[PDB]
Chains A and B, each alone.
Chain A
Amino acid sequence: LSLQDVAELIRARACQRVVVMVGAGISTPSGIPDQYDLPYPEAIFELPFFFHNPKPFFTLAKELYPGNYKPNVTHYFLRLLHDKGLLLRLYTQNIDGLERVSGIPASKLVEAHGTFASATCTVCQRPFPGEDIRADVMADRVPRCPVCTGVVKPDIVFFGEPLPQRFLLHVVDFPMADLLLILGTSLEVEPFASLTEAVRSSVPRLLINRDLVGPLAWHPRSRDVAQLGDVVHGVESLVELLGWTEEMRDLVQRETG
C-alpha cells in the first residue's frame, strides 16, 4: 500500500472518520521551538526546574499567546479535512493553539498536553482564567496567587502529571477510526504515543514525519504507509495527490488579514 492509495481513499470519501495525531513537527514551520536558561530542552515542562526558575516557561507563554504565530499548511490541511466532513477528532501534543486558529472547533480537538486557556495556583490550587494572568506574563512578571502568593502555573501538562480527562475521548474515537494520520511527531511522549496501536488492525496508518518512528518501525502492519522527509513537503504531496492544491492556496492567503 502507498501514499497514492491513501489519497484515493480520501478522494473517494471512503475514509469518513479520520483520526489525526500531531506533535511539535507541525508547528516548527510557523517558528515555534521543540534565548532561555534551560539546562536541557525538556526542563521547560519539568516541575523541579519550574519551581527553581519559572521564567523560561513564562518566556514561552508570552511567545505562545495568540497573534505572534500563524498556522501553516499542515494545520490548514486538517481544516480542509474538517470542512469536507472527514475529521473525527484531532489529537495534539502542541500547546500553541494553532489548531483553533486554523478553524478546527473545540469539539473536534483534544489538547492532550493542556492549554493556556486556564491556570492553577501551584500552592492553594485555586483555578484562574488564562486571561487573568495575561498582563503579568506580558510584563515579564511571574504570576502570583491573590490569595497565597504562590506561582500561578497555566494548565499545561508537565512531566509526571496526569493528562486532562478529555483524553478519554480516545476510547471511543480510535476504535471508530477508518484512517489514522500521524503527522509531525517522533512518538516519544507517553501516553500519547501509545494511541497508534489503538486503531483496528485493518486500518491504514499514515506517518508524515522526518523519520520512521514508533510502532511503524518496530511492529509494522500491512496497511501502514510512511511518507518520510519534511512534514510540509509530505503534506503538499498528499494535497497534490488529492487535487486540493488550488483550494488550499485559496484558503491559506484568504486566512491572512
Chain B
Amino acid sequence: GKVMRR
C-alpha cells in the first residue's frame, strides 16, 4: 500500500 512515512 502507498503510504507516507509520517
Where the two chains meet, the residues of A that have a C-beta atom closer than 8 Å to any C-beta of B are 42, 45, 113, 157-163, 188-191, 193
* Known pairs A160-B1, A191-B2 / 14 extra A-B pairs, C-beta < 8 Å: A42-B4, A45-B2, A157-B2, A158-B2, A159-B2, A159-B4, A162-B1, A188-B5, A189-B2, A189-B3, A189-B4, A190-B2, A190-B3, A190-B5
Closest 6 CB pairs of A and B: A190-B3, A157-B2, A160-B1, A159-B2, A188-B5, A161-B2
A-B contacts, CB under 8 A, total: 30
Main secondary structure of the interface of A (DSSP, over half): loop
Contacts of B3 in A (CB 8 A): 159-160, 189-190
Identity of the chain A residue whose Cβ is nearest the Cβ of B4 in the assembled complex: A188
Min Cβ gap B4→A in Å is 6
Contacts of B5 in A (CB 8 A): 188-190, 193
Chosen A-B contacts, 27 in total, with CB atoms closer than 8 Å, are: A42-B4, A45-B2, A113-B2, A157-B2, A158-B2, A159-B1, A159-B3, A159-B4, A160-B1, A160-B2, A160-B3, A161-B1, A161-B2, A162-B1, A162-B2, A163-B2, A188-B5, A188-B6, A189-B2, A189-B3, A189-B4, A189-B5, A190-B2, A190-B3, A190-B4, A190-B5, A193-B5
Min Cβ gap B1→A in Å is 5
Where the two chains meet, the residues of B that have a C-beta atom closer than 8 Å to any C-beta of A are 1-6
Contacts of B1 in A (CB 8 A): 159-162
Contacts of B2 in A (CB 8 A): 45, 113, 157-163, 189-191
A193, B3: Cα distance in complex, Å: 10
Interface-centre pick from B1, B4, B6 (highest chain A CB count, 10 A): B1
Identity of the chain B residue whose Cβ is nearest the Cβ of A93 in the assembled complex: B2
A190, B4: Cα distance in complex, Å: 6
Identity of the chain B residue whose Cβ is nearest the Cβ of A162 in the assembled complex: B1
Contacts of B6 in A (CB 8 A): 188
Identity of the chain B residue whose Cβ is nearest the Cβ of A45 in the assembled complex: B2
A159, B5: Cα distance in complex, Å: 12
A40, B4: Cα distance in complex, Å: 14
Interface-centre pick from A42, A157, A163, A190 (highest chain B CB count, 10 A): A190
Identity of the chain B residue whose Cβ is nearest the Cβ of A192 in the assembled complex: B2
Contacts of A163 in B (CB 8 A): 2
Identity of the chain B residue whose Cβ is nearest the Cβ of A159 in the assembled complex: B2
Min Cβ gap A108→B in Å is 23
